[PDB]
Amino acid sequence: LVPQLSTISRALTPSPVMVLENIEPEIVYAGYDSSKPDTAENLLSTLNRLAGKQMIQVVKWAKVLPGFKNLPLEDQITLIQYSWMSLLSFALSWRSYKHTNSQFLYFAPDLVFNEEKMHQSAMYELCQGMHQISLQFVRLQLTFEEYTIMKVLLLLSTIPKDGLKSQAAFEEMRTNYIKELRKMVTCPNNSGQSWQRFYQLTKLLDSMHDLVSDLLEFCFYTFRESHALKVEFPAMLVEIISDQLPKVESGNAKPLYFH
């Protein structure tokens, strides 16, 4: 009988972490036009346009993310919709860390926020919050490997209060990626140092919930008063926020914590 299991294939397939590196989206440009006054209406509209372009790349990434296709299609869609802000804000801190040593907020190569832009955007306190996350990346010396696994965990960090179509399939993928992170933090065996770091990384993931809650509060507010505020949103964000706003505001979004 022909062996159905292929030792060669299992040994040859890239590790999950290696696949994450391979499928990570290339950098996206904001299309920022410096001729426009740096007022909140203009800066915020630009950030919304950038967000739409980033999400187009996020969905392509999710399509080839190992294990994600094992979840019901409706759950894949649900998870992207509930995690979008966490994913984009986390990636913003990563780009800021890698490209500016966490000195500025690197939204895109053509849109880098310094203190002035943060004030002008009318969301200064929120910019400071994401900047703080960037500063923690330097203190922790976060690695790309760690970052990629953590971004998947954020995709799996908020679920509908009633649950997904397949909680078991979700739980399997989540436990698998948590395992990857645990192995990632372990040569020189030192359980103590390994657990201390694992703890630092899960505390940071947990801290994303409060930050994301505040970012969404601002997002939903500007969306609701888009006309009065003159803040424009691209189709992709109208699609996402139109779905998310009522679900989050009615208390249906359940955060998953490590601590």
Which residues, 6 or more positions from 224, have their beta carbon under 8 angstroms from its beta carbon? 245
Q: What is the rounded distance in angstroms from the CA atom of residue 52 to the CA atom of residue 233?
A: 8
Decide if residue 162 touches a second copy (CB under 8 A).
no
Q: Which of the choices ligand SNL, a second copy, none does residue 42 contact, using the CB cut-off of 5 to 8 A by kind?
A: none
Binding mask 50-89 for ligand SNL (x = CB under 6 A): xx--x---------------------------------xx
Tell me which of 17, 20, 48, 82 binds ligand SNL, using CB under 6 A. Answer: 48
Residue nearest to ligand SNL (CB): 222
User: Which residues contribute to the annotated binding site for aldosterone?
Assistant: 48, 54, 95, 222
Give the residue with the Cβ less far from ligand SNL, 215 or 248. 215
149: closest CA among 185, 99, 189? Answer: 185
Contact indicator for 48, 230 with CB cutoff of 8 Å: no
The CB-of-133 to a second copy minimum distance in angstroms stands at: 20
Distance of CA 82 to the CA centre of its chain: 11
* Candidate ranges 4-12, 18-26, 216-224, 242-250; the one touching ligand SNL (CB under 6 A): 216-224
Pair of tokens at residue 10:
């299992």
Q: Hey, what amino acid is at 145?
A: E
Structure-token pair, residue 51: 């967000």
Cα–Cα dist 38/108, whole Å: 16
133 binds ligand SNL (CB under 6 A): no
CB-CB contact of 195 with 120 (8 Å): no
Three-state secondary structure call for residue 255: strand
Beta bridge partners of residue 254, listed in sequence order: 159
Maximum Cα interatomic distance, the chain, rounded to a whole number of Å: 72
Among 9, 22, 189, 250, binds a second copy (CB under 8 A): 189
Question: Which residues contribute to the site for ligand SNL (CB under 6 A)?
Answer: 44, 47-48, 50-51, 54, 88-89, 92, 107, 121, 123, 126-127, 130, 215, 218-219, 222-223, 231
Question: Which residues contribute to the site for a second copy (CB under 8 A)?
Answer: 168, 171-172, 174-175, 178, 189-192, 195-196, 199, 202, 256-259
